[PDB]
Amino acid sequence: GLMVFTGNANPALAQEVVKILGIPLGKAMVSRFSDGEIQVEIQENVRGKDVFVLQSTCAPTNDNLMELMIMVDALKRASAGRITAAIPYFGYARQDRRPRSARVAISAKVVANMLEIAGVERIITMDLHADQIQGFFDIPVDNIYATPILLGDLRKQNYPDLLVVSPDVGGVVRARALAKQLNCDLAIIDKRRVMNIIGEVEGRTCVIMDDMVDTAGTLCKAAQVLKERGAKQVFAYATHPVLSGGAADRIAASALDELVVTDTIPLSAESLACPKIRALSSAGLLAETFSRIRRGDSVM
Amino acid sequence: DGLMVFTGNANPALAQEVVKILGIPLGKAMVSRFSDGEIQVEIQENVRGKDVFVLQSTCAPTNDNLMELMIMVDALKRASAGRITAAIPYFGYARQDRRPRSARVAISAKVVANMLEIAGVERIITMDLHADQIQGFFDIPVDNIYATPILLGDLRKQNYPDLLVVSPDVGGVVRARALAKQLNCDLAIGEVEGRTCVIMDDMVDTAGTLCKAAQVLKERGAKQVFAYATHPVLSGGAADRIAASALDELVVTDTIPLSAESLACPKIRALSSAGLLAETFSRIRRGDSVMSLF
Amino acid sequence: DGLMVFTGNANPALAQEVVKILGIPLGKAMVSRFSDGEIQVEIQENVRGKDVFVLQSTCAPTNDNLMELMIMVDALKRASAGRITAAIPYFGYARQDRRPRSARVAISAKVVANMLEIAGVERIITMDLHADQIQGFFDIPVDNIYATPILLGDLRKQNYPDLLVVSPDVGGVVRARALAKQLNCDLAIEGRTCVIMDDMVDTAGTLCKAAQVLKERGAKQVFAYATHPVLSGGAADRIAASALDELVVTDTIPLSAESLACPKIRALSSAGLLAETFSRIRRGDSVMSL
Ligand SMILES: Nc1ncnc2c1ncn2[C@@H]1O[C@H](COP(=O)(O)O)[C@@H](O)[C@H]1O
Ligand SMILES: Nc1ncnc2c1ncn2[C@@H]1O[C@H](COP(=O)(O)O)[C@@H](O)[C@H]1O
Numbered sequence: 001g002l003m004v005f006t007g008n009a010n011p012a013l014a015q016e017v018v019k020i021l022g023i024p025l026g027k028a029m030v031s032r033f034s035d036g037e038i039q040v041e042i043q044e045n046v047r048g049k050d051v052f053v054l055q056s057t058c059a060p061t062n063d064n065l066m067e068l069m070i071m072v073d074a075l076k077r078a079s080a081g082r083i084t085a086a087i088p089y090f091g092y093a094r095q096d097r098r099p100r101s102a103r104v105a106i107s108a109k110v111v112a113n114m115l116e117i118a119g120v121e122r123i124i125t126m127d128l129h130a131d132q133i134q135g136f137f138d139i140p141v142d143n144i145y146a147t148p149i150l151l152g153d154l155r156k157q158n159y160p161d162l163l164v165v166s167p168d169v170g171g172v173v174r175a176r177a178l179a180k181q182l183n184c185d186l187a188i189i190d191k192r193r194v195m196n197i198i199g200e201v202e203g204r205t206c207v208i209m210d211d212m213v214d215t216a217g218t219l220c221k222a223a224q225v226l227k228e229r230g231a232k233q234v235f236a237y238a239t240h241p242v243l244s245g246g247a248a249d250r251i252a253a254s255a256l257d258e259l260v261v262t263d264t265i266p267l268s269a270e271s272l273a274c275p276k277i278r279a280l281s282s283a284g285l286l287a288e289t290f291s292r293i294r295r296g297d298s299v300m
Numbered sequence: 301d302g303l304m305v306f307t308g309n310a311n312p313a314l315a316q317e318v319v320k321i322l323g324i325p326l327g328k329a330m331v332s333r334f335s336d337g338e339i340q341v342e343i344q345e346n347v348r349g350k351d352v353f354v355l356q357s358t359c360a361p362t363n364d365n366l367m368e369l370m371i372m373v374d375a376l377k378r379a380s381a382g383r384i385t386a387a388i389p390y391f392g393y394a395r396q397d398r399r400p401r402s403a404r405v406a407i408s409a410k411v412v413a414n415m416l417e418i419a420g421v422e423r424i425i426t427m428d429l430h431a432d433q434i435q436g437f438f439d440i441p442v443d444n445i446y447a448t449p450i451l452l453g454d455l456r457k458q459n460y461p462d463l464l465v466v467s468p469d470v471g472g473v474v475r476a477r478a479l480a481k482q483l484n485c486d487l488a489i490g491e492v493e494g495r496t497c498v499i500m501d502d503m504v505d506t507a508g509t510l511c512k513a514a515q516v517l518k519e520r521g522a523k524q525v526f527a528y529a530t531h532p533v534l535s536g537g538a539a540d541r542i543a544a545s546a547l548d549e550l551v552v553t554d555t556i557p558l559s560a561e562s563l564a565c566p567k568i569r570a571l572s573s574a575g576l577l578a579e580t581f582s583r584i585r586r587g588d589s590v591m592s593l594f
Numbered sequence: 595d596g597l598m599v600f601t602g603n604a605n606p607a608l609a610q611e612v613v614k615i616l617g618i619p620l621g622k623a624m625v626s627r628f629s630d631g632e633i634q635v636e637i638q639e640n641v642r643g644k645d646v647f648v649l650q651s652t653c654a655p656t657n658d659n660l661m662e663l664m665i666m667v668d669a670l671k672r673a674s675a676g677r678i679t680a681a682i683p684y685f686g687y688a689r690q691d692r693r694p695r696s697a698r699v700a701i702s703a704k705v706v707a708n709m710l711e712i713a714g715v716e717r718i719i720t721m722d723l724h725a726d727q728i729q730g731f732f733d734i735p736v737d738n739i740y741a742t743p744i745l746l747g748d749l750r751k752q753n754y755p756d757l758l759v760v761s762p763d764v765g766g767v768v769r770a771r772a773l774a775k776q777l778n779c780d781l782a783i784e785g786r787t788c789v790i791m792d793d794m795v796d797t798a799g800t801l802c803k804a805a806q807v808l809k810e811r812g813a814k815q816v817f818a819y820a821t822h823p824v825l826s827g828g829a830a831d832r833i834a835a836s837a838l839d840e841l842v843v844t845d846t847i848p849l850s851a852e853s854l855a856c857p858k859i860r861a862l863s864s865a866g867l868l869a870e871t872f873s874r875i876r877r878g879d880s881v882m883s884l
């Protein structure tokens with residue numbers, strides 16, 4: 001019953017997922033017409049099958065979302081038994097509210113509604129930006145943590161004298177949790193009119209952990225501030241390597257020693273040319289989730 | 301009064317011309333991008349209880365323009381707009397209106413219909429919808445307006461001798477004979493020598509079909525060949541192949557903005573659909589008959 | 595196994611033949627009328643957890659046959675059917691699929707799509723749907739099957755001399771070339787045997803004009819094939835009197851008394867094609883492979 005299809009966002013990652021699952025990748029043309037409208041054709045029988053669609057909605061965001069939307073409709077109309085959208089990086093997640101009642105959209109909610117009306121029956125996502133996005137859906141949402149992958153690597157590196165750093169006074173909650181888990185010290189960076197650091201950073205190898213890195217502006221600003229307070233090294237772990245706005249070259253010039261990321265969003269040719277950026281494989285964690293959910297489907 | 305018109309980046313010049321005719325300013329909005337390319341939207345004006353029309357064709361880039369419309373509609377809805385009408389002169393994805401011999405494809409135009417309704421769109425205005433059945437993909441009111449008064453207006457103005465209407469296709473003889481009956485001239489699909497031939501389509505994309513017909517018609521001795529179409533999709537080497545073709549001119553509307561290479565091509569002339577849209581909006585606002593116009 | 599098939603009054607005989615082929619009994623139901631003419635339905639056996647198919651063309655009397663299907667679906671749903679599929683070989687209201695230029699009309703085919711879905715229908719099976727765009731009126735899966743195999747089966751079965759596929763209307767000239775290609779014969783818009791193929795026949799007006807103007811101008815024989823025999827308002831008389839040599843149709847709509855009487859009208863069984871479609875769907879096999 002289990003089938004897996006992919007869009008163009010992450011096709012290599014999907015091949016690794018099905019490899020582990022011991023199944024072939026479902027065949028589909030996912031392409032464009034001459035005018036740039038999305039052309040999709042499911043090129044095998046999906047009738048009554050349990051279908052997973054692996055497509056992060058990373059850049060180009062709207063294209064990847066519409067690829068997903070259209071694939072879902074084709075699968076629905078071809079009478080798939082069940083449709084799951086596996087969206088490791090969730091595009092528009094950062095637009096989850098209207099700050100100070102600004103006349104903006106709650107885009108994460110539009111996307112939620114979009115997927116539901118296309119006929120998506122459940123969501124799998126990774127390190128979702130805000131827990132509250134789960135309530136934008138009236139269908140089941142499974143949010144998986146890539147923390148094991150990242151902590152796995154950080155441990156292999158055996159850094160002395162490890163210290164977790166919270167870049168801002170947001171995730172102090174989560175930074176203490178990480179520091180408790182590796183039982184090391186915690187330091188916090190903040191700006192009161194980035195100036196203040198509480199906890200001495202002097203002899204420390206500092207580590208920063210995040211859901212995503214975008215421009216890398218925060219990571220790189222934090223890293224300097226740490227080397228300015230004597231830090232030996234600064235390392236950044238992040239699940240989703242968005243890496244827009246000349247981030248790779250900003251990283252290249254920074255006080256940051258290394259950026260470790262997941263392969264949810266494949267690396268640019270620029271990023272692959274950047275020795276400070278290194279990827280880890282999220283495929284095993286994805287396959288394990290697909291298998292747990294599949295087990296549930298065969299209960300009834 | 302109460303009426304407001306907004307626009308994304310699909311067709312800004314058309315929007316400006318529409319509001320000029322309406323006698324109102326364009327609604328203030330930032331429709332932009334974040335560094336990662338996700339759409340950035342803020343309504344920069346009060347819209348509470350207002351009768352809001354969003355003017356955005358879902359032309360290329362199709363998905364970006366559709367999502368701008370989606371996100372603007374959400375922004376407006378949450379800012380408590382009284383009513384939201386999507387004015388989509390060119391409806392992208394309209395050609396995916398079925399599954400051919402039931403191939404395992406999407407009915408994309410239905411997906412988009414569902415998306416707009418779920419975002420909070422209450423009414424649709426569109427021009428020369430590729431398929432009339434698309435009106436049935438919606439459960440909200442759909443007004444399909446026609447560029448015929450513009451295109452026929454201009455064609456009649458030209459005052460061509462020995463005027464003959466041609467269906468380039470076969471799946472177009474119905475519309476073509478209706479057009480022939482309205483111009484009272486003969487119809488070809490027929491006899492052609494010595495006569496000025498006119499083709500009317502709702503759409504022009506690559507022009508491959510268009511230009512082939514012009515060639516064939518001339519071979520059989522057509523005096524001149526003219527083409528009239530509402531929507532200038534015009535990809536990818538369309539403008540170039542129209543230039544190099546037996547086609548004397550191609551007249552279109554401005555529902556899709558012309559490219560640089562299309563603006564360079566001296567055979568492509570574009571007519572404003574702005575008057576047609578503005579009168580439509582205006583009639584809708586007063587409850588007057590829209591049908592009348594066509 | 596967990597498969598159940600019920601019929602309304604639109605096509606009882608056909609449903610019995612489908613069900614005979616499948617090797618199962620027809621589902622026990624009363625589908626009838628109260629004294630005032632309101633639909634009376636009771637499901638007279640247990641359906642819970644079962645995979646229920648209802649076979650009902652919404653041919654004339656359209657609204658009664660449509661309302662029978664609505665009421666049956668509701669009763670089945672409330673009797674906890676595991677799943678409901680409406681098998682509607684002829685889909686009534688299919689010709690109302692748009693609003694023409696200057697007409698304040700309903701898109702009735704869509705009202706019907708909405709009705710069916712709100713009743714609890716989960717999957718549609720239909721035959722030679724009049725406009726493919728109707729599939730987009732539903733947000734449930736729709737399987738449109740073709741009667742070409744049973745029509746072409748019969749056509750080849752009588753080895754007509756000098757066969758020529760004819761397109762009568764300008765509309766379906768495209769698929770007329772696709773038919774000719776499949777029989778490897780010519781296409782027309784003389785002294786040959788002409789076959790016309792169609793989705794349906796209603797008044798037979800255009801068929802009969804076509805048959806005449808083919809005959810006037812030469813043709814040996816004229817034969818017509820159409821899946822759906824609607825055949826309303828004088829159709830049988832118009833056909834008897836026409837240049838047609840035979841009209842061949844399927845049994846998705848049972849022949850009225852007048853059509854039965856007309857020796858030019860011959861009906862083929864669609865039961866094997868419906869029964870194969872049910873099995874393939876049930877097994878998860880591909881339908882379009884047919
Ligand atoms: N794709 C994006 N890229 C950069 N910034 C964004 C994006 N989407 C939303 N934002 C901004 O980030 C803010 C939310 O950030 P936060 O306060 O950290 O949850 C929103 O108010 C937006 O202005
Ligand atoms: N954006 C597009 N550009 C070109 N062809 C398309 C597009 N969308 C759909 N089609 C195809 O064009 C055909 C519809 O054209 P028509 O036969 O004129 O209705 C279908 O086979 C579609 O798959």
Ligand SMILES: Nc1ncnc2c1ncn2[C@@H]1O[C@H](COP(=O)(O)O)[C@@H](O)[C@H]1O
Pocket residue numbers: 687689690694
């Ligand atoms: N039950 C019906 N009988 C006859 N004509 C119809 C019916 N329903 C709709 N129509 C009209 O038939 C035309 C399309 O049908 P067709 O000629 O089969 O393509 C439209 O102009 C409809 O208004």
